[PDB]
Amino acid sequence: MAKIILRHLIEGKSHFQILLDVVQFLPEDIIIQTFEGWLLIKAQHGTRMDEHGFISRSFTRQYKLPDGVEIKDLSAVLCHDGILVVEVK
Amino acid sequence: XXXXXXXXXXXXXXXXXXXXXXXXXXXXXXXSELRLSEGKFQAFLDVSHFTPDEVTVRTVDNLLEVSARHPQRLDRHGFVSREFCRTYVLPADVDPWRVRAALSHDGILNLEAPRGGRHLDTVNEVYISL
Amino acid sequence: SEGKFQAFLDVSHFTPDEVTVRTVDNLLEVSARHPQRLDRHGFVSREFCRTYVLPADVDPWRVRAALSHDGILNLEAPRG
C-alpha cells in the first residue's frame, strides 16, 4: 500500500543598521563588543573537521559610528539564516 | 529560509568574509574544495579576499597548510580584518614535497601534487577484553 | 490517549530531509539511513528502521506525521 509523508515546522534618519554575513561562525565563537562608539565583532572558528580538509578562521571587523550615536541604544541579533545585524530600535 | 528550509531570497545590504564548500564525497581512503583523482591530487580555494603576499603555503609533513591573515582595510562597510588556516590531508601515495600552487587574477589558489611516492598499505582488527 | 493511537520516536539523531515512513498494509514503517555526519570526535554513519504494528481498528489512510524542532516525530492514526 501507498507511502505516508511527514509534515510540521513553521534606515535613512533616526536609525542606524549594520547587517553582516556570519557564515558557519557559531554564536559561541562570534562576539559583538561596543567600545566608545565603533561597532566591533569577531568570528574566530576553531580548527574543525570541515568535511574535505580541517579548517580554521578569524574575522574581526570594526564599523565606525556616525558621530551622534551612543553604544547602549544599539541592540544586535544573529538570525538563524546566518545574517547578524547590529541596529538601534 | 524557513524551518523546513523553504527559502525566500534576500540581499539588499552589505556582507562579511568567508565562503561555501564545493562538491565532495566521504568513506574514501585519502581522508571551494578538493578534486584528487587517480594519479593527480589537485585542490582549489577562494583566496580572493587576500593579497598574494598575505598568502603562505607550507607542507608540514603530509599536510598542505594554506595560511592567510590580512589586517584591517577599507572594504565597503568599514575596517575589516580576516584570517584562515585551511589544511588538506594528502594520501600516503602523494609526495609531501613537489607541490605546485597557482594564484589566479580572480583570486583563486589552484594547488596540485602528483601521486607516486610510497606503497600505501593498511587493515587490522582488535578483540574486546570484557 | 483513547480514540487515536500515537507512537513517539525521537528522530533528533537524524535530519528532517532524510526522513521516510511508508504505510504498506496494516503495519506502519519508519526508515531513516543517514550519510556520514561531521560530528566532534569523528565521522559517524547511522541507519534505523522501526516498524510500528498499527491495530486493525486503525486505518491506513489519514495517518498524520509531525516532528517538533526538539526532534520528536509523532506517528498518529485515528481508530475507526
- Helix H, strand E, coil C: the string for chain C is CCCEEEEEECHHHCCCCCCECCCCCCCECCECCCCCECCCCCCECCCCECCECCCCCECCCCCCEEECCCCCEEEEEEEC
**Type and span of the H or E element at A34:** strand A31-34
CB of B130 within 8 A of CB of B103? no
Distance CA(B47)–CA(A22), nearest Å, equals: 18
Residue A88 grid coordinates: 538601534
Residue B67 grid coordinates: 595560511
Residue B96 grid coordinates: 609531501
Residue A4 neighbours by CB distance under 10 Å = 21
Number of domains comprising chain B? 1
CB of A19 within 8 A of CB of A39? no
Distance from the B19 Cα atom to the nearest Cα atom in chain A, whole angstroms:
7
The secondary structure of residue C49, as a DSSP letter, is B
Distance CA(B8)–CA(B1), nearest Å, equals: 6
Nearest CA in chain B to A55: B86
Resolution (angstroms) equals: 3.9
Q: Sign (positive/negative) of CA torsion C57, C58, C60, C61?
A: positive
CB of A60 within 8 A of CB of A2? no
Q: Which residues of B touch A (CB under 8 A)?
A: 1-4, 13-21, 24, 26, 31, 33-34, 69, 72, 77-89
Dihedral class, residue B61 (left if φ above 0, else alpha if ψ from -120 to 50, else beta): left
Residue C55 belongs to domain with CATH number: 2.60.40.790
Residue A85 grid coordinates: 545585524
Residue A89 identity (one-letter amino acid): K
Dihedral class, residue C67 (left if φ above 0, else alpha if ψ from -120 to 50, else beta): beta
Nearest CA in chain C to A46: C40
| Rg of the Cα atoms in chain C | 14
Q: Which of these, C13, C10, C15, lies nearest to C75 by C-alpha position?
A: C10
B6-13: long-range contacts (C-beta < 8 A, 24 or more apart)? B13/A17, B13/A19
Q: Which of these, A19, A30, A12, A20, lies nearest to A87 by C-alpha position?
A: A19
Residue B59 grid coordinates: 607542507
Distance CA(B41)–CA(B34), nearest Å, equals: 8
CB of B112 within 8 A of CB of B43? yes
Distance from the A8 Cα atom to the nearest Cα atom in chain C, whole angstroms:
5
Question: What are the φ and ψ backbone dihedral angles of C12, each rounded to 5 degrees?
Answer: -50, -35
Q: Which of these, A19, A6, A22, lies nearest to A60 by C-alpha position?
A: A22
Q: Sign (positive/negative) of CA torsion A25, A26, A31, A37?
A: positive
CB of A5 within 8 A of CB of A77? no
Residue B76 neighbours by CB distance under 10 Å = 8
Distance CA(A83)–CA(A23), nearest Å, equals: 8
Distance CA(A60)–CA(A28), nearest Å, equals: 15
Place of cell 606503497: B119
Distance CA(B33)–CA(B20), nearest Å, equals: 9
CB within 8 Å of B11: residues ≥ 6 apart: none
Q: Which of these, B55, B68, B60, lies nearest to B90 by C-alpha position?
A: B60
Distance CA(A62)–CA(A32), nearest Å, equals: 10
CB of A62 within 8 A of CB of B31? no
CB of C29 within 8 A of CB of C51? yes
Elucidated via: X-ray
Find out if CATH 1.20.840.10 is the number for domain A17-88: no
B6 interface with C at CB cutoff 8 Å: no
